[PDB]
Amino acid sequence: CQDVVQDVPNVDVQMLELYDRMSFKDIDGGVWKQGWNIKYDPLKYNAHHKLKVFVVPHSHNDPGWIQTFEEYYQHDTKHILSNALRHLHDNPEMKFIWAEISYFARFYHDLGENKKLQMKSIVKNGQLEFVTGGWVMPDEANSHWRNVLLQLTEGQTWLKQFMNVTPTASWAIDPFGHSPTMPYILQKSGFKNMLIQRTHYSVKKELAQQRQLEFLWRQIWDNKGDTALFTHMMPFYSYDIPHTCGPDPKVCCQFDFKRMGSFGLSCPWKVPPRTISDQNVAARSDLLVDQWKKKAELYRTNVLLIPLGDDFRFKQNTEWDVQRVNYERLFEHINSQAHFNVQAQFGTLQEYFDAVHQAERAGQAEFPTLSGDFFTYADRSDNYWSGYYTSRPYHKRMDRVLMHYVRAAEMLSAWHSWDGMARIEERLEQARRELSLFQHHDGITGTAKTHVVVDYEQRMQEALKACQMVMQQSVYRLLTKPSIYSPDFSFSYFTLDDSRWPGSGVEDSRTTIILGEDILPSKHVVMHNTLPHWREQLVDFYVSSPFVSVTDLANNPVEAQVSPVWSWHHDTLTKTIHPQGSTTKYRIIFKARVPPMGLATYVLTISDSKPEHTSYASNLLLRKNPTSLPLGQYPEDVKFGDPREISLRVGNGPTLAFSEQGLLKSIQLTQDSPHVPVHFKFLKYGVRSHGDRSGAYLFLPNGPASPVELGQPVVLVTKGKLESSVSVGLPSVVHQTIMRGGAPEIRNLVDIGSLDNTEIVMRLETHIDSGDIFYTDLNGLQFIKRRRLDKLPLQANYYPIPSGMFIEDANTRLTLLTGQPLGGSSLASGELEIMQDRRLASDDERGLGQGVLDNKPVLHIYRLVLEKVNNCVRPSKLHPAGYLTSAAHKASQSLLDPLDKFIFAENEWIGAQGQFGGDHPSAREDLDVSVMRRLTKSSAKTQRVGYVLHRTNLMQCGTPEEHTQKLDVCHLLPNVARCERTTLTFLQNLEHLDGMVAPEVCPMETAAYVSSHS
Ligand SMILES: N=C(Cc1ccccc1)N[C@H]1S[C@H](CO)[C@@H](O)[C@H](O)[C@@H]1O
Ligand SMILES: *[C@H]1O[C@H](CO)[C@@H](O)[C@H](O)[C@H]1NC(C)=O
Ligand SMILES: [Zn+2]
């Protein structure tokens, strides 16, 4: 196993180092506005060394953006694919590449058998080639690597089954900035090459000058280079035709033959394309070949890639003709004019890469090695695309909730083979596809029009319902005596109870467990733990009485705590934000203990008075001018007081001190230690009154954030033996700090309401001497070192915070983990900040044509971990990566993959069992079974189950942590007959395993295994 901490990789280009060096001046470079006037030596190419040019036709089809997926499919995409089939069928030499499988699959299933066969034929023969092959071309900033793999697998599994092909080349021309998580997953999925386009204009300029636009992209911690994937970065401002034939768009635009007038398009540089004829072909070729040779100077081989396409292109047959015919005339002339020393033709993306590597093997070029990422992107001047790291935060949070439910549903149902009737495969496929669709770079990014965001949301809602159905049928089967099990596949044996989604204050959707001497004395609840280690976690349920006690199924008492059900109300009358307690519903809380990848059943029973093992929390409302807060049968009266500082300590954990406004001010780790200053503060960013305006994509602040005026907010303090919390009703946010004995959980109920042109940021102020360094994660997969650069505007120092960020000095670290991707930064030494929501009245000129005014209440969740790191073995100062501690990592898992909760629906559960999975191995803490998925339907004689295993890397800080068992996923199901290591999509077997044992993986590695069962 490679050491991912102690050996700083040696690479030709390290992006953090490059950023430290670059000056980022935005000067007018001439026709290539962001470059320079490229010059070349005419004699470079000759009879014995020609420039091979591949023109690659393509059509960018957004699975939703300005229209919904189905609207674009009906108005554009089905015609584009229908005409592509006809045109490629009839013109053997024409080529075309396709990226979005969601659309292709929608199209193909609608084709008649005759057409499906013609389609398979132009794919089989090389004319139509799939690039990447994912359900979509995903966002790379907000997406979790697990969902990037999910969508890739969804498109590629469809391609293998119906087109009998698996792309090995990736095409990512539109995500706003690029992540090394992509080559990470692709290289482990059989890929050999990839292409990216949206990187900072200064980076393009810099790498172009060094001919470093093509590179072997390895992971920041990879000393050996085995994770390397060949990458081609496009050099210009756009992938449209004007910015793909060469440096001068005024000239390239003349070679987009769709812009002559009848299609309603034209060249903004004021020179239109002209039909190619025998009289102008030599002059037109002179111009085109000169652009081609200029572009060729930016790369190292004599093989040139010329993409030919734009959004939803190649729709009309007349379009196919006008582009194909004119280019064929150009090629016939150019290829027969020896003096150009050029051989040009239509080609696919794989063709370009194969030729490039043949040049490389001929000793024609050596390529530089590179590590780092390509965030934050700016397409021009100070227009940095850091706004979309936060846009439509409700759906960014929904993404993570669905991410988990998909995993839990696939895992819970994978244990058994199911009758087709049960519609398990059916519900799982819909759930994977709706979550996969949302990975699109206009889905999770929050950059779609309002009615499209609504479409993604309704699709995810149906996916959530599908997961619940599969999960609850699975639990009923796993915990019912087999000879008693009698399933009705349409019936709801259990209801899922989710405490954080939509969240209290967002939607009253949780059911109350109604108990009573005259109706029902008790109720069974069951917890699922998708993680492969034993886990304890507090769980809560709403109950109709405070007099409830918990027992496990052996009837052992379980200590519990009852607290009121508090809801906050913006009182339109008194003009204050204050809480009201329920007099009919109460929260019962207790610690559940659950086997690795297993289930644990508990029973809640009512009594007519206080149960021996249930305690009741005290509640204290701090505000001036209080009114009574009756709590029905709740046994402890609410206390009142004037606002004042408060301190709280649950169990042995930290002691937290809060200001009189209910905000954290210090954290004391142990009884003796100092009260470390850690202050939460909420501020607001505005929008510029003159100049470029912030929108769904761009963050263009009118300077540093300004403190929000808090007034004297109402603060609610609840103190219990198992859980305590402090909640304050701020304007736009009900901020809650919850304590259970470890690092606190922070929840923000964010309702930016009608505050126009405002971005609300949550900031942490500490005295940690972090200087200009901070760390953020990439796709929930790895943490990369960031360096605040004062030479760049504030918005450029904002980065995606898909799951966590931290700052540290020699002794102390503060880590903030998230349950949703948001944008954030560390704008001053000792600080961390993360945007909560943004509401913008203006469009930011990137084509969306609207501002962001569809905000809705969202419940953001976090874990805040303060730790001493002076004893931790950390990477050297020159290493570009950072790593979590065991506590920070478990905290992230508590947010992303919590215990699932199920409430039995009927009065009596006959045949109920107390636990499932007690014999599953409890793996080492840094290992996770990211995916468990049965890959065969019940009619398959040989059943197959796929597993994706990921091992993260945690810092060694002196905690002995031992006694765990080896996890061999191939033996989790009985009767194993074979075990294979496969690509991460499960589509190709890479290794037949001895003894049918799946070895565990190395730190930061991810492997897939498929076990076969007789
Ligand atoms: N990039 C194009 C092609 C193009 C459009 C206009 C001018 C030049 C080239 N289109 C992008 S632009 C848009 C962000 O601005 C993005 O969210 C959307 O998914 C799309 O496909
Ligand atoms: C696709 O599968 C393999 C891959 O090459 C080969 O038999 C041939 O190309 C195709 N045959 C089919 C339809 O399986
Ligand atoms: Zn796009």
Swiss-Prot record:
<dbReference type="InterPro" id="IPR011330">
    <property type="entry name" value="Glyco_hydro/deAcase_b/a-brl"/>
</dbReference>
<feature type="active site" description="Nucleophile">
    <location>
        <position position="174"/>
    </location>
</feature>
<dbReference type="GO" id="GO:0000139">
    <property type="term" value="C:Golgi membrane"/>
</dbReference>
<dbReference type="GO" id="GO:0005783">
    <property type="term" value="C:endoplasmic reticulum"/>
</dbReference>
<dbReference type="InterPro" id="IPR050843">
    <property type="entry name" value="Glycosyl_Hydrlase_38"/>
</dbReference>
<feature type="binding site">
    <location>
        <position position="60"/>
    </location>
    <ligand>
        <name>Zn(2+)</name>
    </ligand>
</feature>
<comment type="pathway">
    <text>Protein modification; protein glycosylation.</text>
</comment>
<dbReference type="InterPro" id="IPR048534">
    <property type="entry name" value="Man2a1-like_dom"/>
</dbReference>
<dbReference type="InterPro" id="IPR011682">
    <property type="entry name" value="Glyco_hydro_38_C"/>
</dbReference>
<dbReference type="GO" id="GO:0006486">
    <property type="term" value="P:protein glycosylation"/>
</dbReference>
<keyword id="KW-0378">Hydrolase</keyword>
<protein>
    <recommendedName>
        <fullName>Alpha-mannosidase 2</fullName>
        <ecNumber>3.2.1.114</ecNumber>
    </recommendedName>
</protein>
<keyword id="KW-0812">Transmembrane</keyword>
<dbReference type="Pfam" id="PF07748">
    <property type="entry name" value="Glyco_hydro_38C"/>
</dbReference>
<dbReference type="InterPro" id="IPR013780">
    <property type="entry name" value="Glyco_hydro_b"/>
</dbReference>
<keyword id="KW-1133">Transmembrane helix</keyword>
<keyword id="KW-0479">Metal-binding</keyword>
<dbReference type="InterPro" id="IPR027291">
    <property type="entry name" value="Glyco_hydro_38_N_sf"/>
</dbReference>
<dbReference type="GO" id="GO:0006013">
    <property type="term" value="P:mannose metabolic process"/>
</dbReference>
<dbReference type="InterPro" id="IPR011013">
    <property type="entry name" value="Gal_mutarotase_sf_dom"/>
</dbReference>
<keyword id="KW-0326">Glycosidase</keyword>
<feature type="binding site">
    <location>
        <position position="441"/>
    </location>
    <ligand>
        <name>Zn(2+)</name>
    </ligand>
</feature>
<feature type="binding site">
    <location>
        <position position="62"/>
    </location>
    <ligand>
        <name>Zn(2+)</name>
    </ligand>
</feature>
<feature type="topological domain" description="Lumenal">
    <location>
        <begin position="1"/>
        <end position="1014"/>
    </location>
</feature>
<dbReference type="InterPro" id="IPR028995">
    <property type="entry name" value="Glyco_hydro_57/38_cen_sf"/>
</dbReference>
<dbReference type="GO" id="GO:0015923">
    <property type="term" value="F:mannosidase activity"/>
</dbReference>
<dbReference type="Pfam" id="PF01074">
    <property type="entry name" value="Glyco_hydro_38N"/>
</dbReference>
<dbReference type="InterPro" id="IPR041566">
    <property type="entry name" value="AManII_C"/>
</dbReference>
<dbReference type="Pfam" id="PF09261">
    <property type="entry name" value="Alpha-mann_mid"/>
</dbReference>
<keyword id="KW-1015">Disulfide bond</keyword>
<keyword id="KW-0333">Golgi apparatus</keyword>
<comment type="subunit">
    <text>Homodimer; disulfide-linked.</text>
</comment>
<dbReference type="GO" id="GO:0005795">
    <property type="term" value="C:Golgi stack"/>
</dbReference>
<dbReference type="Pfam" id="PF18230">
    <property type="entry name" value="Glyc_hyd_38C_2"/>
</dbReference>
<dbReference type="GO" id="GO:0046872">
    <property type="term" value="F:metal ion binding"/>
</dbReference>
<dbReference type="GO" id="GO:0035010">
    <property type="term" value="P:encapsulation of foreign target"/>
</dbReference>
<keyword id="KW-0862">Zinc</keyword>
<dbReference type="InterPro" id="IPR015341">
    <property type="entry name" value="Glyco_hydro_38_cen"/>
</dbReference>
<dbReference type="GO" id="GO:0006491">
    <property type="term" value="P:N-glycan processing"/>
</dbReference>
<comment type="similarity">
    <text>Belongs to the glycosyl hydrolase 38 family.</text>
</comment>
<keyword id="KW-0472">Membrane</keyword>
<keyword id="KW-0735">Signal-anchor</keyword>
